[PDB]
Design a protein around this ligand. Sequence first.
Ligand SMILES: COc1cc(/C=C/C(=O)O)ccc1O
Length: 328
Amino acid sequence: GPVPSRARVYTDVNTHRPREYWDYESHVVEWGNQDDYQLVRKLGRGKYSEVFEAINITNNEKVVVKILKPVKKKKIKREIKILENLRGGPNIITLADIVKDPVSRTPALVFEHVNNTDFKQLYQTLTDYDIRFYMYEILKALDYCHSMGIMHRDVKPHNVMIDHEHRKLRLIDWGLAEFYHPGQEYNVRVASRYFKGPELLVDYQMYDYSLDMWSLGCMLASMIFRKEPFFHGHDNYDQLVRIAKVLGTEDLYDYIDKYNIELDPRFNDILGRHSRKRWERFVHSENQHLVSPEALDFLDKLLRYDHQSRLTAREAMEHPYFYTVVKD
Ligand SMILES: COc1cc(/C=C/C(=O)O)ccc1O
């Protein structure tokens, strides 16, 4: 069988929390008044929810309402409990209220409003300094939630809301987030394809916070190289092949050999043999102003096959890439 794995940090946070903290199935929801919120316009529909701009008529302020689609009560309670646990943490979206929607007959989560410019347009205008700044802000959120025993598991541009006017960032959609418990096996069908870590793609279930750090690395690569997404697979198998064409196949085999993991035999005909590449090959005249030796070293230390080898969020915040970023 597979070799077991543990997070190298925050390993036992939930072990030593009171049970109430991580036992979300027993959580009792405290409901607000649904009539406080007037829906204004639909912003989007995801796989698990519909999102609306709304007004809180008790203060005439903008809010966002997320009306959950029917899922098992645990996943609903999971997201709710995680949002309440993380509330007030750095760059964590603030859950303001929870109400029962009379039409959907499901919970509607009420969030602070973030006046966001969408990432396709925003990423086209970000300067070198902007990328470092916003990366540091994301790391604050990730170190916080990891330090609180929670992995996000769906880090991607869509879930990083940025108000570029006030240089404000919020990590959103905690609907796939989980509590980390040492030795627990998790569903590998998380994250969006382009941001899935090698551990998911080789079906290794005993993963941890470090999954988010791979996803963050995929984001960083897309931003500094101006290629979104960076690893552009046509499915989950091709996704691993695209990664292997960059990180190389020998280190992939070292990874799966370390954990005594077997590749899906369907890779026999598609994987090939690939050298590891140097990151400089992705630099060209239209992205070079976003690239520095510090950026490439930082990227290199996020994008490791071995989840145990990746920078932790805290380690990442110590990286020379962020020396240029003005600290508060
Ligand atoms: C789409 O704009 C927003 C979305 C959210 C939350 C989404 C989620 O948690 O799933 C919060 C504030 C927003 O301004």
